[PDB]
PDB file of C-alpha atoms (C1' of nucleotides) in Angstrom:
ATOM      1  CA  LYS A   8      12.977  20.288  -5.709  1.00 22.34           C
ATOM      2  CA  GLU A   9       9.753  19.509  -3.849  1.00 21.58           C
ATOM      3  CA  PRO A  10       9.200  20.606  -0.553  1.00 21.97           C
ATOM      4  CA  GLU A  11      11.361  18.462   2.839  1.00 22.78           C
ATOM      5  CA  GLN A  12       7.947  18.155   4.206  1.00 22.90           C
ATOM      6  CA  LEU A  13       6.261  16.534   1.433  1.00 26.09           C
ATOM      7  CA  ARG A  14       9.318  14.288   0.791  1.00 28.64           C
ATOM      8  CA  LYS A  15       9.126  12.680   4.188  1.00 27.60           C
ATOM      9  CA  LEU A  16       7.834   9.951   6.214  1.00 26.64           C
ATOM     10  CA  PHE A  17       7.165   9.089   9.765  1.00 26.96           C
ATOM     11  CA  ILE A  18       7.709   5.851  10.404  1.00 26.94           C
ATOM     12  CA  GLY A  19       5.835   4.837  13.861  1.00 24.42           C
ATOM     13  CA  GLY A  20       6.288   1.501  15.749  1.00 25.84           C
ATOM     14  CA  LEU A  21       9.827   0.827  15.075  1.00 23.66           C
ATOM     15  CA  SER A  22      11.516  -2.372  16.650  1.00 25.28           C
ATOM     16  CA  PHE A  23      13.378  -1.690  19.810  1.00 28.84           C
ATOM     17  CA  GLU A  24      16.413  -2.464  17.891  1.00 30.84           C
ATOM     18  CA  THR A  25      15.838  -0.339  14.742  1.00 32.39           C
ATOM     19  CA  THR A  26      19.020   1.901  13.768  1.00 29.78           C
ATOM     20  CA  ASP A  27      19.269   4.752  11.451  1.00 33.23           C
ATOM     21  CA  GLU A  28      21.334   2.155   9.494  1.00 32.67           C
ATOM     22  CA  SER A  29      18.902  -0.666   9.279  1.00 35.95           C
ATOM     23  CA  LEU A  30      15.983   1.965   8.628  1.00 34.14           C
ATOM     24  CA  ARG A  31      17.695   3.224   5.605  1.00 36.98           C
ATOM     25  CA  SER A  32      18.612  -0.205   4.313  1.00 33.62           C
ATOM     26  CA  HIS A  33      14.960  -1.080   4.499  1.00 32.76           C
ATOM     27  CA  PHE A  34      13.121   2.428   2.926  1.00 35.36           C
ATOM     28  CA  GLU A  35      16.372   2.294   0.721  1.00 30.51           C
ATOM     29  CA  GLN A  36      14.378  -0.044  -1.658  1.00 34.15           C
ATOM     30  CA  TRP A  37      12.154   2.734  -2.875  1.00 35.07           C
ATOM     31  CA  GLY A  38      14.361   5.353  -3.685  1.00 34.72           C
ATOM     32  CA  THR A  39      17.346   7.669  -2.453  1.00 34.11           C
ATOM     33  CA  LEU A  40      16.827   8.646   1.317  1.00 37.18           C
ATOM     34  CA  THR A  41      18.418  12.506   1.643  1.00 36.47           C
ATOM     35  CA  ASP A  42      17.461  11.655   5.307  1.00 37.19           C
ATOM     36  CA  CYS A  43      17.049   8.942   7.596  1.00 35.61           C
ATOM     37  CA  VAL A  44      17.090   9.039  11.308  1.00 36.27           C
ATOM     38  CA  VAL A  45      15.420   7.174  14.408  1.00 34.00           C
ATOM     39  CA  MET A  46      14.583   9.312  17.620  1.00 34.39           C
ATOM     40  CA  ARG A  47      16.386   8.660  20.710  1.00 32.91           C
ATOM     41  CA  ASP A  48      15.899  10.007  24.217  1.00 34.34           C
ATOM     42  CA  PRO A  49      17.963  12.834  24.650  1.00 36.40           C
ATOM     43  CA  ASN A  50      19.501  11.430  27.802  1.00 35.08           C
ATOM     44  CA  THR A  51      19.191   7.559  27.893  1.00 33.62           C
ATOM     45  CA  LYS A  52      19.771   7.585  23.997  1.00 32.16           C
ATOM     46  CA  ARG A  53      17.394   4.696  23.922  1.00 34.31           C
ATOM     47  CA  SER A  54      15.450   4.633  20.867  1.00 35.12           C
ATOM     48  CA  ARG A  55      11.676   6.184  21.452  1.00 34.84           C
ATOM     49  CA  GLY A  56       9.918   3.772  18.726  1.00 31.18           C
ATOM     50  CA  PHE A  57       9.825   5.806  15.926  1.00 30.45           C
ATOM     51  CA  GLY A  58      11.619   7.571  13.126  1.00 30.06           C
ATOM     52  CA  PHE A  59      12.054   9.968   9.846  1.00 30.59           C
ATOM     53  CA  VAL A  60      13.031   8.585   6.253  1.00 29.49           C
ATOM     54  CA  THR A  61      13.040  11.387   3.323  1.00 28.05           C
ATOM     55  CA  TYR A  62      13.199  10.848  -0.326  1.00 27.25           C
ATOM     56  CA  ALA A  63      14.644  12.838  -3.208  1.00 27.86           C
ATOM     57  CA  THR A  64      11.331  12.903  -4.849  1.00 27.29           C
ATOM     58  CA  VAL A  65       7.464  13.022  -3.422  1.00 27.74           C
ATOM     59  CA  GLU A  66       7.167  10.261  -6.435  1.00 23.93           C
ATOM     60  CA  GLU A  67       9.462   7.883  -4.127  1.00 23.22           C
ATOM     61  CA  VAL A  68       7.296   8.380  -1.262  1.00 21.90           C
ATOM     62  CA  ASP A  69       4.448   7.493  -3.027  1.00 19.36           C
ATOM     63  CA  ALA A  70       6.205   4.121  -4.057  1.00 15.80           C
ATOM     64  CA  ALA A  71       6.861   3.436  -0.418  1.00 14.03           C
ATOM     65  CA  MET A  72       3.384   4.090   0.489  1.00 11.30           C
ATOM     66  CA  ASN A  73       2.147   2.056  -2.178  1.00 11.58           C
ATOM     67  CA  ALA A  74       4.576  -0.386  -0.870  1.00 12.32           C
ATOM     68  CA  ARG A  75       2.758  -1.482   2.484  1.00  8.49           C
ATOM     69  CA  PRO A  76       2.542  -3.254   4.478  1.00  6.82           C
ATOM     70  CA  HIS A  77       6.582  -2.861   5.789  1.00  8.54           C
ATOM     71  CA  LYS A  78       8.011  -5.057   8.135  1.00 11.49           C
ATOM     72  CA  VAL A  79      11.399  -3.610   9.513  1.00 12.87           C
ATOM     73  CA  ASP A  80      13.618  -5.855  11.390  1.00 10.94           C
ATOM     74  CA  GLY A  81      11.057  -8.636  11.708  1.00  8.48           C
ATOM     75  CA  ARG A  82       8.475  -5.843  12.779  1.00  9.25           C
ATOM     76  CA  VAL A  83       5.371  -4.243  11.223  1.00  7.88           C
ATOM     77  CA  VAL A  84       5.895  -0.638  11.099  1.00  6.91           C
ATOM     78  CA  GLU A  85       3.345   2.051  10.294  1.00  9.33           C
ATOM     79  CA  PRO A  86       4.644   4.801   7.566  1.00  9.74           C
ATOM     80  CA  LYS A  87       2.704   7.927   7.186  1.00 12.24           C
ATOM     81  CA  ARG A  88       2.706  11.239   5.562  1.00 12.80           C
ATOM     82  CA  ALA A  89       4.840  13.668   7.993  1.00 13.72           C
ATOM     83  CA  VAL A  90       2.858  16.155   9.768  1.00 14.09           C
ATOM     84  CA  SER A  91       4.659  19.362  10.125  1.00 11.76           C
ATOM     85  CA  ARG A  92       5.567  20.537  13.555  1.00 11.34           C
ATOM     86  CA  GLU A  93       3.269  23.388  13.213  1.00  8.07           C
ATOM     87  CA  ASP A  94       0.243  21.158  12.186  1.00  8.81           C
ATOM     88  CA  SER A  95       1.235  18.530  14.888  1.00  8.77           C
ATOM     89  CA  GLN A  96      -0.228  20.827  17.454  1.00  6.06           C
ATOM     90  CA  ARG A  97      -3.786  20.048  16.168  1.00  5.34           C
ATOM     91  CA  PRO A  98      -6.061  17.937  18.154  1.00  3.28           C
ATOM     92  CA  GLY A  99      -6.064  14.148  16.852  1.00  3.10           C
ATOM     93  CA  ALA A 100      -3.461  15.388  14.011  1.00  4.41           C
ATOM     94  CA  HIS A 101      -1.952  12.081  14.152  1.00  8.28           C
ATOM     95  CA  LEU A 102      -4.816  10.098  14.337  1.00  7.74           C
ATOM     96  CA  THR A 103      -5.302   6.931  11.710  1.00  8.15           C
ATOM     97  CA  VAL A 104      -8.400   8.575   9.861  1.00 10.65           C
ATOM     98  CA  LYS A 105     -10.311   7.679   6.727  1.00 11.27           C
ATOM     99  CA  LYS A 106     -13.044  10.785   6.751  1.00 11.51           C
ATOM    100  CA  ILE A 107     -12.417  14.313   6.300  1.00  7.79           C
ATOM    101  CA  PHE A 108     -14.429  17.248   6.956  1.00  9.28           C
ATOM    102  CA  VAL A 109     -14.566  19.875   3.877  1.00 10.26           C
ATOM    103  CA  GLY A 110     -15.756  23.138   4.961  1.00  8.03           C
ATOM    104  CA  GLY A 111     -16.615  26.371   2.948  1.00  5.52           C
ATOM    105  CA  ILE A 112     -18.725  24.910  -0.041  1.00  5.44           C
ATOM    106  CA  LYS A 113     -21.091  26.795  -2.208  1.00  6.33           C
ATOM    107  CA  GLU A 114     -24.857  26.186  -2.042  1.00  5.59           C
ATOM    108  CA  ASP A 115     -25.036  24.580  -5.167  1.00  7.16           C
ATOM    109  CA  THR A 116     -22.182  22.066  -4.518  1.00  3.41           C
ATOM    110  CA  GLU A 117     -23.164  18.432  -5.626  1.00  2.84           C
ATOM    111  CA  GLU A 118     -21.248  15.122  -5.523  1.00  2.00           C
ATOM    112  CA  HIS A 119     -19.468  15.310  -8.821  1.00  2.00           C
ATOM    113  CA  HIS A 120     -17.967  18.599  -7.772  1.00  2.00           C
ATOM    114  CA  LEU A 121     -16.431  16.694  -4.705  1.00  2.00           C
ATOM    115  CA  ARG A 122     -15.502  13.726  -6.947  1.00  2.00           C
ATOM    116  CA  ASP A 123     -13.848  15.837  -9.587  1.00  2.00           C
ATOM    117  CA  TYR A 124     -11.456  17.231  -7.282  1.00  2.00           C
ATOM    118  CA  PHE A 125     -10.885  14.147  -4.350  1.00  3.20           C
ATOM    119  CA  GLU A 126     -10.868  10.915  -6.491  1.00  3.08           C
ATOM    120  CA  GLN A 127      -7.278  11.470  -7.812  1.00  5.88           C
ATOM    121  CA  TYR A 128      -6.279  10.685  -3.892  1.00  4.40           C
ATOM    122  CA  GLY A 129      -7.907   7.409  -3.758  1.00  3.99           C
ATOM    123  CA  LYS A 130     -11.110   5.172  -3.352  1.00  2.75           C
ATOM    124  CA  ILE A 131     -13.834   7.226  -2.166  1.00  5.76           C
ATOM    125  CA  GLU A 132     -16.261   5.633  -0.414  1.00  9.04           C
ATOM    126  CA  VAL A 133     -18.796   7.904   1.197  1.00 12.43           C
ATOM    127  CA  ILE A 134     -19.772  11.440   0.129  1.00 10.81           C
ATOM    128  CA  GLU A 135     -22.321  13.333   2.430  1.00  8.01           C
ATOM    129  CA  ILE A 136     -23.247  17.128   1.854  1.00  6.47           C
ATOM    130  CA  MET A 137     -24.472  17.983   5.311  1.00  8.74           C
ATOM    131  CA  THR A 138     -28.324  19.794   5.636  1.00  8.65           C
ATOM    132  CA  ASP A 139     -29.716  21.066   8.170  1.00  7.61           C
ATOM    133  CA  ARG A 140     -32.096  18.964  10.123  1.00  4.59           C
ATOM    134  CA  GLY A 141     -35.935  19.883   9.603  1.00  6.31           C
ATOM    135  CA  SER A 142     -34.773  22.877   7.347  1.00  6.36           C
ATOM    136  CA  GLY A 143     -33.159  21.029   4.601  1.00  4.66           C
ATOM    137  CA  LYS A 144     -30.895  23.660   4.064  1.00  4.91           C
ATOM    138  CA  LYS A 145     -27.211  23.274   3.026  1.00  4.00           C
ATOM    139  CA  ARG A 146     -24.778  23.771   5.856  1.00  3.49           C
ATOM    140  CA  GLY A 147     -21.769  24.665   3.713  1.00  2.00           C
ATOM    141  CA  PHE A 148     -19.446  21.634   4.508  1.00  2.00           C
ATOM    142  CA  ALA A 149     -19.357  17.929   3.463  1.00  2.00           C
ATOM    143  CA  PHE A 150     -17.750  14.626   5.034  1.00  2.00           C
ATOM    144  CA  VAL A 151     -16.095  12.247   2.281  1.00  2.00           C
ATOM    145  CA  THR A 152     -14.736   8.967   3.232  1.00  2.00           C
ATOM    146  CA  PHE A 153     -12.057   6.737   1.618  1.00  2.41           C
ATOM    147  CA  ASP A 154     -10.608   3.468   1.996  1.00  2.93           C
ATOM    148  CA  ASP A 155      -7.172   4.015   2.768  1.00  7.00           C
ATOM    149  CA  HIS A 156      -6.175   6.557   5.497  1.00  8.85           C
ATOM    150  CA  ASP A 157      -3.256   7.597   3.405  1.00  8.39           C
ATOM    151  CA  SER A 158      -5.630   9.199   0.811  1.00  8.43           C
ATOM    152  CA  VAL A 159      -6.759  11.240   3.853  1.00  8.99           C
ATOM    153  CA  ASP A 160      -3.117  12.256   4.510  1.00  6.92           C
ATOM    154  CA  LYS A 161      -2.069  13.056   1.090  1.00  3.88           C
ATOM    155  CA  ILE A 162      -4.814  15.828   1.254  1.00  3.95           C
ATOM    156  CA  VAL A 163      -4.804  17.125   4.894  1.00  4.50           C
ATOM    157  CA  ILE A 164      -0.892  17.869   4.478  1.00  5.99           C
ATOM    158  CA  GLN A 165      -1.863  20.301   1.357  1.00  2.41           C
ATOM    159  CA  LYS A 166      -2.850  24.004   2.359  1.00  2.30           C
ATOM    160  CA  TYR A 167      -5.215  24.260  -0.518  1.00  2.00           C
ATOM    161  CA  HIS A 168      -7.941  22.492  -1.982  1.00  4.75           C
ATOM    162  CA  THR A 169     -10.586  23.565  -5.110  1.00  5.33           C
ATOM    163  CA  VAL A 170     -14.320  22.349  -5.198  1.00  5.01           C
ATOM    164  CA  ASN A 171     -16.889  23.681  -7.261  1.00  2.00           C
ATOM    165  CA  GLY A 172     -14.715  26.405  -8.643  1.00  2.33           C
ATOM    166  CA  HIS A 173     -13.361  27.630  -4.746  1.00  2.75           C
ATOM    167  CA  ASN A 174     -11.158  27.147  -2.467  1.00  5.26           C
ATOM    168  CA  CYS A 175     -12.328  24.776   0.810  1.00  8.94           C
ATOM    169  CA  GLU A 176     -10.705  23.784   4.036  1.00  8.32           C
ATOM    170  CA  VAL A 177     -10.237  20.243   4.441  1.00  6.70           C
ATOM    171  CA  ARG A 178      -9.240  18.727   7.897  1.00  7.97           C
ATOM    172  CA  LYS A 179      -9.286  14.937   9.612  1.00  4.82           C
ATOM    173  CA  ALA A 180     -12.508  14.408  10.443  1.00  9.27           C
ATOM    174  CA  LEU A 181     -12.837  14.309  14.400  1.00  9.93           C
ATOM    175  CA  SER A 182     -15.839  12.534  16.277  1.00 11.94           C
ATOM    176  CA  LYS A 183     -18.615  14.059  18.180  1.00 11.85           C
ATOM    177  CA  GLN A 184     -16.647  13.442  21.563  1.00  9.63           C
ATOM    178  CA  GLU A 185     -13.127  14.185  19.782  1.00  9.56           C
ATOM    179  CA  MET A 186     -14.500  17.758  19.294  1.00 10.52           C
ATOM    180  CA  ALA A 187     -16.159  18.330  22.465  1.00  8.54           C
ATOM    181  CA  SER A 188     -12.384  17.321  24.203  1.00  9.06           C
ATOM    182  CA  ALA A 189     -10.801  19.649  22.187  1.00  7.36           C
ATOM    183  CA  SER A 190     -13.184  22.234  22.100  1.00  6.20           C
TER     184      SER A 190
ATOM    185  C1'  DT B   1       3.980   5.386  17.349  1.00  2.53           C
ATOM    186  C1'  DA B   2       4.869  13.031  16.356  1.00  2.08           C
ATOM    187  C1'  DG B   3      11.048  15.663  15.149  1.00  6.30           C
ATOM    188  C1'  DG B   4      17.159  16.087  15.595  1.00  6.51           C
ATOM    189  C1'  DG B   5      20.245  23.065  20.816  1.00  4.01           C
ATOM    190  C1'  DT B   6      13.731  23.759  14.919  1.00  7.51           C
ATOM    191  C1'  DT B   7       9.631  29.367  16.234  1.00  5.67           C
ATOM    192  C1'  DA B   8       8.812  37.028  17.989  1.00 11.16           C
ATOM    193  C1'  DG B   9      13.784  41.143  17.455  1.00 11.83           C
ATOM    194  C1'  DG B  10      15.099  45.576  17.689  1.00 12.83           C
ATOM    195  C1'  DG B  11      14.012  49.549  16.414  1.00 11.38           C
TER     196       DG B  11
END
DNA sequence: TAGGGTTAGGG
């Protein structure tokens, strides 16, 4: 069976009145939920405004994401691929981004190589193989922009990505200032 | 809108 982590969705912006039962009731429309819960304050037992839903298969997860926008208990919520506790440590880990940093690509890497691997994740809007200003030399990394944040999330939650025959590190793109803040 | 007593022993 597929890994729990890839079968789980983080549901953000939950209404103050959303409960395990009401959440389950809504998301159950796209599959069998093996787990459904609203995080609450360990003390006040008040809802922290977010929860998690886990389907029996990632296919069902995809159905749910393809069903956006979602409105639960009269409120628009934000469903996202669950970022593991380990990766949640990374700066910007939970931000909604459409651009990815692709690091460690060969010198002879060309745009078709990137498309042949990334198009299966979603509509690609921009592709940029970075070069040195003035030297024209390839820097060994590229940026790819999609039209849906879920395309990016489906990517970054995986460990390996093969472009132009070899593995590369793919992470959410961080702005110039976001970089220096986490530097 | 980022996790539910869910993360380094003892040889």
